[PDB]
Amino acid sequence: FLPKGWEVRHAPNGRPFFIDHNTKTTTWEDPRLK
């Protein structure tokens, strides 16, 4: 359900940080919510 190279991983703090595995970019916000 994600864009190519996008991750939804939950850090040990219990938060899902969405990684862009293409351009090495990271964001807490979700492209799916848009």
Binding site: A11, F17, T26, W28
Partner: peptide, 9 residues
């Protein structure tokens, strides 16, 4: 607030 990158492709 910085989110950790990816290690695994």
């Amino acid at each position: 607030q910085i989110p950790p990158p990816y290690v695994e492709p």
